Amino acid sequence: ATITQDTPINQIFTDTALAEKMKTVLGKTNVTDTVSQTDLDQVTTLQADRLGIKSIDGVEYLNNLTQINFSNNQLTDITPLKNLTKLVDILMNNNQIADITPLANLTNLTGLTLFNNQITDIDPLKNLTNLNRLELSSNTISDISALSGLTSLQQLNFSSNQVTDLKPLANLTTLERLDISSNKVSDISVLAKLTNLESLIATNNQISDITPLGILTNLDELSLNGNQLKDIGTLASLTNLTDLDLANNQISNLAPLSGLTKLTELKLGANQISNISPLAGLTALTNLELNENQLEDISPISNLKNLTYLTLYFNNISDISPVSSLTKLQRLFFYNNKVSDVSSLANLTNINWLSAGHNQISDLTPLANLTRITQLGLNDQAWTNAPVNYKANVSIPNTVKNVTGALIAPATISDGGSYTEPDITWNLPSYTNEVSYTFSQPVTIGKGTTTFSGTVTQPLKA
């Protein structure tokens, strides 16, 4: 393509925003300044992301382009790319491209980034066999047969599409990093062929059988979060794993993890785990997620001295004291458990986020010296006191203590009872099996602020 003679920049690039950008690239003072083909023929790269471009009309005269960035714009038609056969790399994520037919003869492409578009038919990719990087997430792709001849691919991402059939991946044995998350995949048997895989991300699919992973011994990163896993026996073979995400599945038996001592991050939340003994040797762990299981005994955590992040919320834990040795902890979440004694938490001097609501905590004094705290959760405690004798008039000590050691006055007291520090008193005409009170006290520890609140049940025995 050539402009016959010199033309105003704003006549070649009809897009207002692209005309401005090209005025700067082409060293001119305004958009109506004329330019020659020889000026145009100098442009070899173009960074034009984030400029509100709607049309790339004019780009066809930039004959020597090898790399372009038009990401984060409002492109629909990419026809002007069709003849730009010196293009090696294209960044075009976050546009409204529906038709990629203009890419079909760009056979020198080694990188093509097209995520976040309106792409369905990828047949125009089929002859782009020099590609080593290809990013197609967040489109409406259901057929990846066009990928089958892309035998130099090292990195491939098509997460957030509607793919069921992975068979076209079979011959892509140079793949090292693959992401197929948020598709409609159940059968990952073709993945057994991809023995060079180092990273496999496959969250939010319908995978129950992971036997095909058994020979993928080069895997260092694996994510199967949001699947239907139960038997993870195959993972024992994956001795190079350092980062493993298995959250939101149906796993109970963790024995296959026990030899995976390279692990530094391990997500196991939302499963069926009641025994974490097999985790005890994973001493390189800095992050461990165990929320939403059926844990009571967490004693096997005590040796994991490198943990800086730990989740335990939604379990059946009464004894939190195994965390006392995890002196590097910076964030600890254990909301919805049955913990009453937080004396052990005085040890976690570097703690910054402490999330402890919906437990049985009555006394904040062991937390008083934790001044690196910036986020704090103490709402909605509840516990039941040891019973006391039912009588016509019943008096109990209030036992809710603030961080200062001062008793916190009840907010409400059942059965018309009253408070005179330190005693809560009820006049009880007829026998009742229990009485109760609530408390609600804003509090700050360091720079972390919450409402320390709860409901206290007092059984009365006759």
Q: Residues interacting with other proteins, by CB under 8 A? A: 50, 71-72, 91, 93-94, 113, 115-116, 133-135, 137, 155-157, 159-160, 177, 179, 181-182, 199, 201, 203-204, 221, 223, 225-226, 245, 247, 267, 287, 291, 308-309, 311, 313-314, 330-331, 333, 335-336, 353, 355, 357, 375-377, 448-450
Which does residue 308 bind out of other proteins, Cl ion, none, counting CB within 5 to 8 angstroms by kind?
other proteins
Partner interacting with residue 418 (select from Cl ion, other proteins, none; CB below 5-8 Å by kind)? none
| Distance of alpha carbon 380 from alpha carbon 358, whole angstroms | 5
φ, ψ for residue 377, nearest 5 deg: -135, 115
Identity of the residue numbered 42: Q
In the complex, the smallest distance separating the C-beta of residue 174 from Cl ion, rounded to whole angstroms, is 47
Least distance in angstroms from the C-beta of 333 to Cl ion: 7
| Dihedral sign (CA 407, 413, 419, 423) | negative
Q: Identify which of residues 180 and 312 has a Cβ nearer to Cl ion in the complex.
A: 312
Residue nearest to Cl ion (CB): 377
* Pick 309 or 419: Cβ nearer other proteins: 309
> Which residues here bind Cl ion, judged by CB under 5 A?
335, 355, 357, 377
Angle in degrees, CA 10, 70, 111, rounded to 5? 135
Please give the Cα distance from 110 to 67 (Å, whole number): 10
The distance of closest approach from Cβ of residue 335 to Cl ion in the complex, given in angstroms and rounded to an integer, is 4
CB 153 within 8 A of CB 126: no
Distance CA 68, CA 338 (A): 57
Are the CB atoms for 134 and 125 separated by under 8 Å? yes
383 binds, among other proteins, Cl ion, none (CB under 5 to 8 A by kind): none
Q: Are 405 and 426 in contact (CB under 8 A)?
A: no
Shortest Å distance, C-beta 60 to other proteins: 26
* Minimum distance of other proteins from residue 453's CB (angstroms): 14
DSSP characters over 379-390? --EEEEPPPEE-
Q: In the complex with other proteins, which residue's Cβ is closer, 187 or 221?
A: 221
Residue closer to other proteins by CB (options 50, 391) is: 50
**Helix (H) or strand (E) run with residue 21 in it:** helix 16-25
- Min. distance of Cβ 385 from Cl ion in angstroms? 23
Give which of Cl ion, other proteins, none residue 267 binds (C-beta under 5 to 8 Å, depending on kind): other proteins
Q: Locate tokens 């009820």: which residue? A: 426
H/E segment holding residue 457: strand 448-461
- Residue nearer to other proteins on the CB measure, 33 or 176: 176
Nearer to other proteins by Cβ, of 377 and 417: the residue is 377
Give Cα 252 distance to the centre of its chain.
22
Q: Is 88 left (phi over 0), alpha (psi -120 to 50) or beta?
A: alpha
Nearer to other proteins, 60 or 179 (CB): 179
Output the smallest distance, CB 168 to other proteins, in A.
17
